[PDB]
Motif scaffolding. Structure first.
Motif, PDB file in Angstrom:
ATOM      1  N   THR A  65      55.816  38.338   8.990  1.00 36.15           N
ATOM      2  CA  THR A  65      55.197  37.928   7.623  1.00 36.15           C
ATOM      3  C   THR A  65      55.914  37.076   6.890  1.00 36.15           C
ATOM      4  O   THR A  65      55.527  36.011   6.383  1.00 36.15           O
ATOM      5  N   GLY A  66      57.219  36.913   7.349  1.00 34.02           N
ATOM      6  CA  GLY A  66      58.069  35.783   6.945  1.00 34.02           C
ATOM      7  C   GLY A  66      58.420  35.529   5.244  1.00 34.02           C
ATOM      8  O   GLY A  66      59.185  34.765   5.012  1.00 34.02           O
ATOM      9  N   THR A  67      58.027  36.792   4.670  1.00 35.72           N
ATOM     10  CA  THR A  67      58.231  36.609   3.089  1.00 35.72           C
ATOM     11  C   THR A  67      59.738  36.918   2.829  1.00 35.72           C
ATOM     12  O   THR A  67      60.393  36.505   2.004  1.00 35.72           O
ATOM     13  N   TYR A  68      60.495  37.603   3.800  1.00 33.34           N
ATOM     14  CA  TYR A  68      61.930  37.721   3.490  1.00 33.34           C
ATOM     15  C   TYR A  68      62.753  36.701   3.984  1.00 33.34           C
ATOM     16  O   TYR A  68      63.794  36.556   3.314  1.00 33.34           O
ATOM     17  N   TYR A  69      62.367  35.890   4.838  1.00 37.18           N
ATOM     18  CA  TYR A  69      63.247  34.739   5.555  1.00 37.18           C
ATOM     19  C   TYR A  69      63.146  33.643   4.658  1.00 37.18           C
ATOM     20  O   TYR A  69      64.131  33.063   4.341  1.00 37.18           O
ATOM     21  N   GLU A  70      61.950  33.378   3.957  1.00 39.30           N
ATOM     22  CA  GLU A  70      61.890  32.448   2.834  1.00 39.30           C
ATOM     23  C   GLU A  70      62.874  32.602   1.789  1.00 39.30           C
ATOM     24  O   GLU A  70      63.658  31.729   1.479  1.00 39.30           O
ATOM     25  N   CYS A  71      63.157  33.934   1.282  1.00 39.70           N
ATOM     26  CA  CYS A  71      64.001  34.235   0.306  1.00 39.70           C
ATOM     27  C   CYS A  71      65.208  34.231   0.879  1.00 39.70           C
ATOM     28  O   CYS A  71      66.266  34.446  -0.030  1.00 39.70           O
TER      29      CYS A  71
ATOM     30  N   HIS B  37      60.151  26.804   6.096  1.00 35.36           N
ATOM     31  CA  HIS B  37      60.816  27.949   6.613  1.00 35.36           C
ATOM     32  C   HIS B  37      59.990  29.130   7.154  1.00 35.36           C
ATOM     33  O   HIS B  37      60.385  29.956   7.955  1.00 35.36           O
ATOM     34  N   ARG B  38      58.637  28.976   6.634  1.00 35.42           N
ATOM     35  CA  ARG B  38      57.807  30.094   7.332  1.00 35.42           C
ATOM     36  C   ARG B  38      57.735  29.763   8.896  1.00 35.42           C
ATOM     37  O   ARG B  38      57.665  30.852   9.753  1.00 35.42           O
ATOM     38  N   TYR B  39      57.477  28.521   9.293  1.00 37.06           N
ATOM     39  CA  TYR B  39      57.434  28.291  10.654  1.00 37.06           C
ATOM     40  C   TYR B  39      58.781  28.567  11.400  1.00 37.06           C
ATOM     41  O   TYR B  39      58.802  29.101  12.347  1.00 37.06           O
ATOM     42  N   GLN B  40      60.027  28.294  10.698  1.00 35.70           N
ATOM     43  CA  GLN B  40      61.186  28.761  11.167  1.00 35.70           C
ATOM     44  C   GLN B  40      61.031  30.357  11.502  1.00 35.70           C
ATOM     45  O   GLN B  40      61.385  30.914  12.602  1.00 35.70           O
TER      46      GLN B  40
ATOM     47  N   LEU C  77      53.875  53.744  11.835  1.00 38.98           N
ATOM     48  CA  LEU C  77      54.567  54.182  10.627  1.00 38.98           C
ATOM     49  C   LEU C  77      55.553  53.165  10.076  1.00 38.98           C
ATOM     50  O   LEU C  77      55.672  52.981   8.757  1.00 38.98           O
ATOM     51  N   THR C  78      56.221  52.421  11.061  1.00 42.46           N
ATOM     52  CA  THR C  78      57.182  51.423  10.593  1.00 42.46           C
ATOM     53  C   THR C  78      56.341  50.353  10.121  1.00 42.46           C
ATOM     54  O   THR C  78      56.751  49.559   9.002  1.00 42.46           O
ATOM     55  N   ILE C  79      55.141  49.844  10.555  1.00 39.69           N
ATOM     56  CA  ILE C  79      54.589  48.649   9.892  1.00 39.69           C
ATOM     57  C   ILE C  79      53.912  48.985   8.653  1.00 39.69           C
ATOM     58  O   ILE C  79      54.042  48.015   7.696  1.00 39.69           O
ATOM     59  N   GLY C  80      53.561  50.273   8.567  1.00 36.28           N
ATOM     60  CA  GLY C  80      52.884  50.632   7.258  1.00 36.28           C
ATOM     61  C   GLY C  80      54.073  50.795   5.814  1.00 36.28           C
ATOM     62  O   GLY C  80      53.688  49.990   4.966  1.00 36.28           O
ATOM     63  N   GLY C  81      55.069  51.295   6.479  1.00 34.68           N
ATOM     64  CA  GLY C  81      56.229  51.281   5.547  1.00 34.68           C
ATOM     65  C   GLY C  81      56.629  50.250   5.212  1.00 34.68           C
ATOM     66  O   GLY C  81      57.127  49.876   4.090  1.00 34.68           O
ATOM     67  N   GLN C  82      56.859  49.233   6.165  1.00 35.95           N
ATOM     68  CA  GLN C  82      57.427  48.028   5.834  1.00 35.95           C
ATOM     69  C   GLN C  82      56.413  47.184   4.854  1.00 35.95           C
ATOM     70  O   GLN C  82      56.774  46.567   3.873  1.00 35.95           O
ATOM     71  N   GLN C  83      55.213  47.064   5.087  1.00 39.33           N
ATOM     72  CA  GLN C  83      54.182  46.645   4.145  1.00 39.33           C
ATOM     73  C   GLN C  83      54.346  47.126   2.807  1.00 39.33           C
ATOM     74  O   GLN C  83      54.297  46.375   1.775  1.00 39.33           O
TER      75      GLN C  83
END
Lengths: 267, 267, 267, 267, 267, 267, 267
Positions: free
Chosen positions: D112-118, D168-171, D23-29
């Motif tokens: 997923t890394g899309t939050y860390y990039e931003c 940043h994705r690597y990090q 549920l947490t995975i789906g909700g986060q996505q």
């Protein structure tokens, strides 16, 4: 639990009225979309409109009246004090059931408006238009009756045509709403006067209605069973046994006269 | 377990109100999308708007009031101390059930806003616009009433048209929200005053409501059974047996007078 | 096994709160996607934003409070020692159930951010931009209020417009997260203080809640059955038999006075 | 056989943890794909990242802790020898159930890394790049904060932008894996120390857990039934019969005082 | 509960009439859309129209009359006072059932109008048209009979062709509506005269109809069972046992004469 | 209730005739659409038409006659007073069942008309055509027989070809309708003469038909059971026990002669 | 009720013949559409046609004859007065069942005609054609045998090719219809002669057929049960108990000789 809910729905007049209204709406939509086409001739248009506008409504009203079994018995009681008032209330209930169909037909066929446009596309008041001054009366009718069916002229003609069509749509929808409001007010005041002139109290009415319905049903069932027993007895006199029994011990072969005996049903 | 939950839902007023609201929303959406078209004439527009805005709401309110069976009995008790207050509470409950439909109709038809645009597209306050200074009053009305239905002019005209339409949409949605808030506050304070003026305690109220409902139901069932027994006895006097029995030993053939005897139902 | 799990779910508050939250999320999404459009006028924008942002939240909160049956009884007990604390805990439980809807509405409508952009698109701090120096104040407001609804200008204008819109989206999402965190902390500390000030132990609380619920249910059922028996007895006095019995041996025909006798329900 | 497997699954902690994680995975996505957009301003970016990265994790952790009923009872036992250790083990089990949600949220949002990039697109170490030498600090921040949201510059700029984004994705993914490994090791060593410090043997533990659960359930059921019997007795004292019985022979009509008698619930 | 509703529907004449009407509508639509094509010759057109217009209606009427079993018995009673009137009422009921099919066929085939256009496309009154003055009579018929099937001429010809076709469609639909109205009025007045001339009262009629139906059914069943018993006895005389019995103790082998004995069925 | 309705349908001749007609219609449509192609040679066309037009009808008629079991018994009674008339009525009923298939085949294959066009495309009366005057007789036949299959010539040729084809379609449909009407009239008058010449009354006929059917069925069942018992007895004489019994106490091993004993079935 | 209808269908020869015909039609269609290709060589064509035309028919006929179990017993009775006639009738019934398959195969493969075209595409009578006068005999055969498979020449060649192909299709379909008619007439006259030469009456025939079938079935079942009992007794002699019994009290361990004892089955 099925037949329970079936009888509960059959008793509920709201469901029957809703079903009738929905069937009439669907039938009108299909009927209009399938077999309607404006003739757009010079004098044979208004009749083509009024036919579809009126005749089905009257026909459905007569059908809703005559198809009610109790109405025939009441009329037979009338055809060649308190009884008069009770017959009036019965007629009122039947009328309340029947009127739903033609009213909704009229309402839908006016709100859609496609019949009214073709009904009065010749009475269009054309007095302040630039292109309708030089033309003679005959050609005026010719070009006025040709708006609803097709379009073949330049943009000014189609402009005045769209304006006239929109005016007639407005008239149709206004007439429809007036009919709806007036009819509901009439029905309400008629129910009010029925409650006012009722010689029975609020509770005796329920007992009376249940009595009438149950009376019809039980008399039907009892007459059926009685005639069944009588015919069973005549069959036993002919053949010599009961149609339902098993291991019959005596079988009376019929003679050439008893066939003639059974030819008549004793009315 | 089915009929259990069926009765539990039927008792639950929240479900009935939700169903009514959903049906009104769907019906309004279909009605608007099917049979609505702006006439955009010079004086026959505001009426075309106000009809769809008001008349269905009033009609549905009258229908929600009159279709309630208990309301007729209460009115009959009223038409020609504590009883007054109990009748007031009954009328209040009926009104609370009935008001839901026209309120939600008004709410949806204002929040969608497509009716209000066509309702007051002529009262648009046009005083600070560059193209509406030279034009006379008549042609001004002509070009102002032509915005909602169609668009045929250059970009400046469509710009002022979109601006006016957006202004009217804003007005409509604001009016809708004001109606919603005011109506809910009125309903809340009315329920509060009903709780305040109630001469019954919190527990006697439950007993009273259950008593009224159960009273109606049992009187219905008992009157039905009583009339059924009476008609069964008259049938036994006519034919000579019970409609439910089997292997009847005596069958009395009716005479030409007893048919006349059964013609009257003894009222 | 069905009704077992049904009751287990009905008791489970987590399921009810989840359902309420999901319904509010879906309703907000549909409502926003259907009936929202920025007016982008000069002074009639902030109100159009604040209406959708606030009014539904307050309305849903009032609805979640008033729709709770126990709240009315508690208020009636309050309107004209230990009882005070027990009433406080009951009010607390009701508030905990009710607050879920407006909170989730606010949360979703801020995280989506489309309402906040249209809410404060005029308070945009424009002080360090190259195109907003020569323009007067009125035309400045005119061109600033026109960003959210449409785009018609060259690339520099759309660039500053996208920048302002992104800034406002950031503000909206930050405000939403602050609201979520502050509200959860407040709810947690309130549950903590409710546990602290409870005069009952951990076990007496369970017994008390079960007692209240079961009390309401049984009193309902018993009052229903009692009134049913009383009405059955009055029916036997009127007609002369029991509505449930079969093969009734005596049928007392009612007189014209006993109908008047049954007209009053003895309150 | 259905409810058997239902209870077997409800007992199985592995299923509950798997469901929570899914549920947490789906909700986060869904949450990320719906309501996320980089503001890419000069100083209001890192906060926009850290909010989505941290706040939901803390919120879900607090929710997983407080929603556990036993935790409230334990805290009440603590708020104003062996019992201390047993309370420690209970708290440990609750924590083990609760921690799953925020941990998986953090894990997925880092992998997923899309939050860390931003989140850290401004701290990019730009020291050995050809285009970032002449530009001043302010414009440097302006062009560095504009990489994540959009792209508008020539190919060299997009090249350095893709390089920074990949770094940043690597990090992000490395940080995520470190978090996963460290957290699992911590959980393992904590379970080890819980087994080490347990004063109970391997078998007494099973008996104790079953005892606690069964204790809560039976006390609930018994308190419910006891209050039900007490209210039934008060109802018999009021009306004069049992709510469950049939063919009651005595019906005591209540007086105006006994209603006041039943107003209080005896707490 | 299935066979209950099945018999209730079978008794309900409204359902049978509705089914017949729907089947005729569907059959006419398919028949017209599949196997209809105008020959558009000089003299062989009107017959091609009148065939499809009339012959199926007469055929279906004869089929609805002859397929009724009771009609054959009544005719046999007639072929070589009160009985006359009862036979008249029976014939009336049969006619009322039968007439539905050809009437609805005619109605649909006239309202669709595609048959009537091809029926009287040669009798078109062409007297005030610009292109039909110079042409001789033979070529006039040639070009007039060629309108319905195909179109190959310039725009003026197709214009006069569309005008003539629309005129004929108008005529067809008007004729159809006149037929519907006249037929319903005739049916109503015929039911009225049937109620007027009935020597039986309202209640004896129900008993009589139920008697006739039940009579036929029971005589059928009883004759079947009687012949079954007789044949069973002859079989026991031949073989020496009962066809239904088990563990027969005597088995009489048949001789070469008893086969000849059983060759005749005793009529 | 299933097998009840199954037998009710099997008795209902209307259903059997409807099914036969529908099967023949579908089979003719598929047969025509699949394996039909005009040879369009000079003398081998009329035969190709008449084959498909006639031969299947005769074949299906012979099949409907011979497949009736009772017809064989009747013919055997005939092959080497009242009995003559009863045999005539039986033959009449069988003929009435059988004739349905070839009649509907002929009807459909004439109304579709595609067989008749290819049947008489050479007898076309070509006497008043502009292109058929100079051509010799042989080439005339060559070009006349080439119309139905293909088209390769200029527009005048295709015009006269379409005219001839439409004429032949008209002839086919007229012939089909004449066949339908004449055949139904013949069937009606034949049923009339069957009712006229019947020496039995209306009621004896029902008894006679039921007697014949029930006679056949019971004799079948009884002969089956009798032979079964006889073979069971021979088996007990061979092996020493009953094939249906259990726990047989004596098992007689067969000898080499008793196998020869059982070789003959005693006819 | 399932197995009832299953046996009713299995007895019904009409269903079995219909299924066989349908299977042969489908198989022929698939077989032709999949694995057929004209070799179109000079002398190896007629054989390629006659193979597919004849060989499968003969093969299926032999298969339908030999697969009938009763035919083997009858032949064994024949291989090394009244019995002769009864054997003749049995052989006749078997032949009537068997002949259906090859007849329908031939019929379909001739009516489709694609095999016959490839069968006799070399015997085409080419004597009055313009292009076949100068060519020698060998090249004539070469170009005549190349028509069915492919087309590569100018339009005159394809014209004469289509003409020849249509002629051969006509011949094929005519031959097919002649075969159908002649075969049905032969079958009818053969059934007639079978009815004429039958020494049994109409009723003895039914008894005889039922006797034969029931005889075979019961002898099968009885022989099975008898051998089962004998083997059960030998098993009890070997091991010491009954294979069906439970709680056996004596278990005789087998010796090394009794295994050799059971090696032979006593034939």
């Amino acid at each position: 639990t099925l037949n329970n809910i079936v009888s509960s729905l059959q008793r509920n007049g709201i469901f029957i009225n809703s079903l009738i209204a929905a069937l009439t709406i669907g039938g009108q939509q299909l009927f209009s979309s399938s077999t309607f086409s404006c003739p757009c001739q010079v004098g044979k248009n208004f009749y083509y409109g009024s036919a579809f506008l009126v005749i089905p409504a009257l026909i459905l009203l007569v059908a809703g009246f005559a198809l009610r079994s109790q109405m025939w018995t009441i009329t037979g009681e009338y055809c060649c004090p308190l009884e008069c008032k009770l017959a009036c209330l019965r007629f009122f209930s039947i009328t309340g059931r029947a009127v739903i169909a033609p009213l909704t037909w009229l309402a839908v066929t006016l709100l859609t408006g496609t019949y009214y446009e073709c009904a009065a596309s010749e009475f269009a008041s054309v007095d302040h238009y630039p292109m309708f001054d030089n033309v003679s009366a005959s050609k005026r009718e010719e070009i006025l009756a040709g708006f609803p069916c097709c379009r073949s002229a330049p943009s000014d003609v189609i402009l005045v045509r769209d304006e006239i069509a929109l005016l007639h749509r407005y008239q149709s929808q206004m007439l429809g709403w007036i009919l709806i409001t007036l009819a509901t007010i009439a029905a309400l005041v008629s129910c009010c006067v029925a409650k006012c002139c009722s010689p029975l109290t609020s509770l005796q009415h329920c007992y009376w209605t249940s009595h009438l319905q149950n009376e019809r049903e039980l008399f039907e069932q009892a007459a059926e069973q009685h005639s069944r027993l009588l015919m069973m007895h005549r069959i036993k006199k002919l053949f010599g046994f009961i149609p339902g029994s098993e291991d019959v011990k005596h079988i009376r072969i019929p003679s050439c006269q008893d066939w003639k005996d059974i030819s008549v049903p004793t009315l």
